[PDB]
Amino acid sequence: EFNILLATDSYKVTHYKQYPPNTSKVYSYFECREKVKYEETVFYGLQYILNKYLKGKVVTKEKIQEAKDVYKEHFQDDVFNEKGWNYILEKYDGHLPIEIKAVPEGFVIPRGNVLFTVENTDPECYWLTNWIETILVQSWYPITVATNSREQKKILAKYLLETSGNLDGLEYKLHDFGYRGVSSQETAGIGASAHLVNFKGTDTVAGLALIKKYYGTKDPVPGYSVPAAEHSTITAWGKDHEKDAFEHIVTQFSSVPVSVVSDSYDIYNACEKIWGEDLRHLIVSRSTQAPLIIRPDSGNPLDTVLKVLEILGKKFPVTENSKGYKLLPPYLRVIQGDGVDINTLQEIVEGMKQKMWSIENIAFGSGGGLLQKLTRDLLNCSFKCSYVVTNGLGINVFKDPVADPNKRSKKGRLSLHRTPAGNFVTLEEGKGDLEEYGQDLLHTVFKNGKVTKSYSFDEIRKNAQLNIELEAA
Amino acid sequence: EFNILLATDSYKVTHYKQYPPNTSKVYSYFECREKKKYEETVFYGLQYILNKYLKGKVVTKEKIQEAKDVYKEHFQDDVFNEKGWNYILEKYDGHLPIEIKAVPEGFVIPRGNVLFTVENTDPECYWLTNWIETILVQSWYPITVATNSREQKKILAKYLLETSGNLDGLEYKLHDFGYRGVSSQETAGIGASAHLVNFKGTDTVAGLALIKKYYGTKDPVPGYSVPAAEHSTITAWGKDHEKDAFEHIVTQFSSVPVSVVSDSYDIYNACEKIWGEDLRHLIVSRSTQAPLIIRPDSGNPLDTVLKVLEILGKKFPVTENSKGYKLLPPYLRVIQGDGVDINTLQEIVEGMKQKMWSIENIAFGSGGGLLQKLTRDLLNCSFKCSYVVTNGLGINVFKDPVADPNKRSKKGRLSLHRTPAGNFVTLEEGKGDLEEYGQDLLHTVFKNGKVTKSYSFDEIRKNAQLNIELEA
Ligand SMILES: O=C(NCc1ccc(S(=O)(=O)c2cc(F)cc(F)c2)cc1)c1ccc2n(cc[n+]2[C@@H]2O[C@H](COP(=O)(O)O)[C@@H](O)[C@H]2O)c1
Ligand SMILES: O=C(NCc1ccc(S(=O)(=O)c2cc(F)cc(F)c2)cc1)c1ccc2n(cc[n+]2[C@@H]2O[C@H](COP(=O)(O)O)[C@@H](O)[C@H]2O)c1
């Protein structure tokens, strides 16, 4: 079972002895520190953490003894604060005397603003604020996934709108393929859930259950998929029977959408001779609601897509849409599910545009690019102390490294407000109390072991919408 | 609870309908595919997955119904294979009719070799082999962490030996700082455990319980740490009182090693004036078993390390070792715990050598670089079907994309052998049965819901040792 006493960086076990004597308050905040890309971030994921790890009775006698025994060997010494944790158990029935204020999940906030704050509600538990820094900082991941996913939606929206004149099917244009390419099962659920803030297509099943448990949707599920082959279901038929494989598969799924990887041996042959000639009759007979979706999976992502499109364009009846862009017949589509990240996604859609192909024709699948190739330094997600009370006196604290002004932290009690022009501003040094910027936009989401405010997955999605989607009014 | 029926890529739910009819076996393998540097990989992590996710009764009535309900909505259709899963429940009491063979954990294997294979043991469960591809492929992570950590140990070993003449304290030269920088709690435990295959220093506590539960060590714990400050424990004293913070901290931990971040306001002032003059008397009196370990945390990693060393070298008595490199007094050391990955680690030690500073002086902490900034395509960890039996006839199968020969897969039944020169070779097309190449190095680790062979963390560490360590 999880033990919050064992869920922090080792050195933090020793920090209680390091604060100035008579410290009664430690106050800390989390921001996506400012540095041309990623100017605004989607705040998402804290609610998961609060519910799974921080709420209720997270301290027991058994957990204290367990931590005590581990740390004695781990430090080769008795530095573990047994007394502090026993106080929490006895005084608060194992509930954390902590208050956390945060912006609503789904909110899109410019870099450099306070996103959440943490402070102890009991003087005895001054040391507790930064004990849970490590676990709270992991919110960087759902935040970064949601933001990076949304940034890709922006690109897709722009090119779909330009090449087709609408945003139909936008929420199915970037599909989650990252299940095998992430570092764990838990990461898979968290990351997939973060992607679903922006899209509805996912193969990472783990995301569904997490959303249902911690967030909730009106609909039965937040994400969807359709049948598709893998290399094993093609190659198993033997190299000489790839056509037999294709025919069986499209026949088994004749009335629903089906995607078929076509690069096991020769993508260009499979498109031109097998799909385009041998099995063409089984494709042109398919309903608009059940297209064949051809998936290339190798080579240069842009070059392969362009060639595949030129091939299908010569074997199938291509139309020209109202914007002048070429469109495959509605029973035929393409998905590129290899080598896709935010950079290559941009290169492909731009390349398609230059060759007069509508983005209607294509969908994208992304795995490691979507869920694994992200770090905490992408958005500079950072947790710092800004305010302490020692000897009854409030002190505004901060770091300001001489060789890196970018690592400067904010001072004093923080608050988030609207500016007269409708933008966000973070106020420091308790200045929010002056009431010149209206009310603090942060909400208390956690206090004394209880989750005091939460958001449905439907509300989060609403909060995270694009302006171009909002401009459908 | 965890549901194996819900722990696969969505489209795999539909694969049981796509295999050739009359298919009784699907046989797949895992490799770190060679690319036209990481020429060898540490195999570690499978045993965790086997025990946590695959063993025992992993199928129940409720789990089948739950998946049926989820997939009906997820697909807007009834594609879920309720029959197949029910068969496993009734015939084998929810145990997976699967056999997995694997190279022993800790083993260091060149790229392009089979590391494990998976196959079904019951004809009806042909579809099951690749159902569990997704969960098994995630072993790429501890493999890649263990491998990348080991390569960094090679670099540290090389420079430590060259500048000091020995490898003393090597296993404490790269400390795990990655807990806050990883994507989740589970990843934290997995990654920290992989790093501990090569080193003994970690602040990612989660790794310790994972090792104890799934692997085991003779010693109480596999990893260690010492007291250290963070920015909050310094800054809380107020800007004008950094010295008070430093003094109080080194005094609290006078008898044990202590590390103190010194760049809150001005790293160069702190070393030359505060540590180097104001509090110098509290440093020079410390035991060799309890040094102060100064930590910079900003600026160019190499440039700051060099300047700090240059500062400390002129405020403290520096000796010159037998190899000619400069050495701080035993009560004073440095740890660089910011901006460290395998690339910058190389640049830092090389830079130190240029300036005649021994690697004895320095330790490294690595966080995101150690545990997060890694991907599956670093080693090209891949899982492919190589052999099936249809109509009673086994056929060798494989992919070979025209535009990327690097993605070509291996054919037929595989085995791993020692070459006459003592290296490694993977035999394809069942050629291992000819027995010209000694015994298959893969062992059955999993069969029919049971873990059949396990390894202690001690064995794994022994297996993954450096050659240069074996040379001593
Ligand atoms: O097809 C796959 N799923 C089914 C599927 C079919 C079509 C669409 S659609 O056209 O969006 C669409 C959606 C819709 F809701 C409704 C619709 F009508 C259509 C969505 C989904 C499928 C395919 C492949 C796949 N995978 C999961 C991992 N993989 C491979 O594994 C590797 C992982 O990637 P990385 O190496 O980068 O980490 C990579 O090679 C990658 O190809 C899944
Ligand atoms: O000191 C820290 N721990 C205690 C400690 C003290 C000394 C040594 S030693 O000299 O190896 C040594 C070892 C030994 F076994 C025995 C000995 F005698 C000596 C090891 C360990 C410490 C410090 C910092 C720290 N952290 C955990 C995250 N962090 C920060 O958080 C951030 C995470 O990094 P990324 O952004 O790259 O992801 C980064 O700013 C990073 O500095 C931990």
What torsion, rounded to 10 degrees, do the Cα atoms B412, B415, B421, B423 define? 100
Residue entry with tokens 């009991």: A122
Q: Taking the alpha carbons of A208, B206, B210, B170 in that order, is the dihedral positive or negative?
A: positive
Tell me if residue A458 falls in helix, strand or coil.
helix
Q: Is A412 left (phi over 0), alpha (psi -120 to 50) or beta?
A: left
Closest to A374 in 3D by CA, of A120, A168, A169, A194: A194
Are B402 and B34 spatial neighbours (Cβ–Cβ below 8 Å)? no
Amino acid letter, B107 = F
Instruction: Find how far residue B9's CA is from the centre of its chain.
Output: 24
Are B361 and B8 spatial neighbours (Cβ–Cβ below 8 Å)? no
Amino acid letter, A31 = E
Token pair for residue B356? 């005649």
- Between CA B207 and CA B400 the distance in angstroms is 39
Are B329 and B287 spatial neighbours (Cβ–Cβ below 8 Å)? no
Residue nearest to atom 7 of ligand 2 (CA): B259
Tell me if residue A40 falls in helix, strand or coil.
strand
The number of beta carbons lying within 10 Å of the beta carbon of residue A158 is 18
Closest to B151 in 3D by CA, of B379, B459, B424: B379
CATH numbers and ranges of domains, chain A: 1-137+376-454 (no CATH), 138-375+455-473 (3.20.20.70)
Method used to solve the structure: X-ray
Distances from the Cα of A385 to the Cα of A406, B176, B239, B283, angstroms: 16, 23, 13, 28
- Between CA A148 and CA A161 the distance in angstroms is 20
Rg of chain A over all Cα atoms, to the nearest angstrom: 26
Q: Taking the alpha carbons of A279, A280, A285, A286 in that order, is the dihedral positive or negative?
A: positive
Distances from the Cα of A23 to the Cα of A124, B253, B470, angstroms: 9, 19, 52
Residue B172 in contact with ligand 2 by CB distance below 6 A: yes
- Between CA A33 and CA A398 the distance in angstroms is 14
A184 to B179: CB separation less than 8 angstroms, yes or no: no
Beta-carbon contacts of residue A65 (< 8 Å; ≥ 6 apart): none
- Between CA B398 and CA B388 the distance in angstroms is 10
The number of beta carbons lying within 10 Å of the beta carbon of residue A204 is 30
Q: In sequence order, what DSSP letters do the residues of A263-324 get, joined into one string? A: -SS-HHHIIIIIIIIISGGGTTTS-TTS-EEEE--SS-HHHHHHHHHHHHHHHS--EE-TTS
Instruction: Find how far residue B198's CA is from the centre of its chain.
Output: 9
Are B224 and B231 spatial neighbours (Cβ–Cβ below 8 Å)? no
Token pair for residue B224? 């260690």
- Between CA A336 and CA A389 the distance in angstroms is 56
Are B5 and B66 spatial neighbours (Cβ–Cβ below 8 Å)? yes
Beta-carbon contacts of residue A16 (< 8 Å; ≥ 6 apart): A81, A84, A126, A127
**A260 forms bridges with which residues in the sheet?**
A294
Distances from the Cα of A352 to the Cα of A159, A303, A334, A340, A348, angstroms: 9, 10, 12, 15, 6
Nearest-CA distance A45 → chain B (Å):
11
Q: Taking the alpha carbons of A263, A266, A268, A269 in that order, is the dihedral positive or negative?
A: negative
Task: Tell me whether strands A40-42 and A108-110 are parallel, antiparallel or unpaired.
Answer: antiparallel
For residue B135, give the chain A residue with the closest CA: A180
Distances from the Cα of B134 to the Cα of A173, B30, B244, angstroms: 23, 12, 54
Which helix (H) or strand (E) segment is A144 a member of?
Answer: helix A140-164
Beta-carbon contacts of residue A340 (< 8 Å; ≥ 6 apart): A301, A348, A364, A365, A366, A367, A369, A370
Please count the residues of chain B: 472
Burial of B103 (0-12, 13-18, 19+ CB in 10 A): buried
Closest to A461 in 3D by CA, of A46, A171, A52, A176: A171
- Between CA B371 and CA B235 the distance in angstroms is 28
**Three-state SS across chain B?**
CCCHHHCCEHHHHHHHHCCCCCEEEEEEEEEECCCCCCCEEECCCHHHHHHHHHCCCCCCHHHHHHHHHHHHHHHCCCCCCHHHHHHHHHHHCCCCCEEEEECCCCCEEECCCEEEEEEECCHHHHHHCCCCHHHHHCCHHHHHHHHHHHHHHHHHHHHHHHHHCCCCCHHHCEEECCCCCCCCHHHHHHHHHHHCCCCCEECECHHHHHHHHHCCCCCCCCCECCCECCHHHHHCCCHHHHHHHHHHHHHHCCCCCEEEECCCCCHHHHHHHHHHHHCHHHHCCCCCCCCEEEECCCCCHHHHHHHHHHHHHHHCCCEECCCCCEECCCCEEEEECCCCCHHHHHHHHHHHHHCCECHHHEEEEECHHHHCCCCCCCCCEEEEEEEEEECCEEEECCCCCCCCHHHCCCCCCCEEEECCCCCEEEECCCHHHHCCCCCCCCEEEEECCEECCCCCHHHHHHHCCCHHHHCC
A259 to B190: CB separation less than 8 angstroms, yes or no: no
- Between CA B293 and CA B63 the distance in angstroms is 53
Which helix (H) or strand (E) segment is A199 a member of?
Answer: none
- Between CA B383 and CA B31 the distance in angstroms is 7
- Between CA B330 and CA A396 the distance in angstroms is 37
Closest to A267 in 3D by CA, of A330, A211, A317, A334: A334
Which helix (H) or strand (E) segment is A354 a member of?
Answer: helix A342-354
Task: Tell me whether strands B319-320 and A319-320 are parallel, antiparallel or unpaired.
Answer: unpaired
Interface test with A, best of B1, B4, B9 (most A CBs within 10 A): B9
Resolution in A: 2.1
A129 CA to centre of ligand 1 in angstroms: 42
**A114 forms bridges with which residues in the sheet?**
A31
**A426 forms bridges with which residues in the sheet?**
A416
Q: Which of B134, B186, B373 sits opposite A187 (nearest CB)?
A: B186
Task: Tell me whether strands A326-327 and A319-320 are parallel, antiparallel or unpaired.
Answer: antiparallel
Ligand 1 pocket (Cβ < 6 Å) reads A 172, 175, 177-178, 180-181, 201, 203, 224-226, 228, 257, 259, 293, 297, 335, 337-338, 363, 365, 367-369; B 9-11, 376
Nearest-CA distance A128 → chain B (Å):
12
> Within 13 Å and on the Cβ side, how many CA atoms surround B305?
30
Beta-carbon contacts of residue B199 (< 8 Å; ≥ 6 apart): B149, B153, B171, B172, B173, B174, B175, B176
Residue B228 in contact with ligand 2 by CB distance below 6 A: yes
Are A120 and A448 spatial neighbours (Cβ–Cβ below 8 Å)? no
- Between CA B170 and CA B316 the distance in angstroms is 24
Residues of chain B found within 8 Å of residue A253, distances taken between Cβ atoms:
14, 17
**A224 forms bridges with which residues in the sheet?**
A201
Tell me if residue A445 falls in helix, strand or coil.
strand
Residue entry with tokens 């109202």: A322
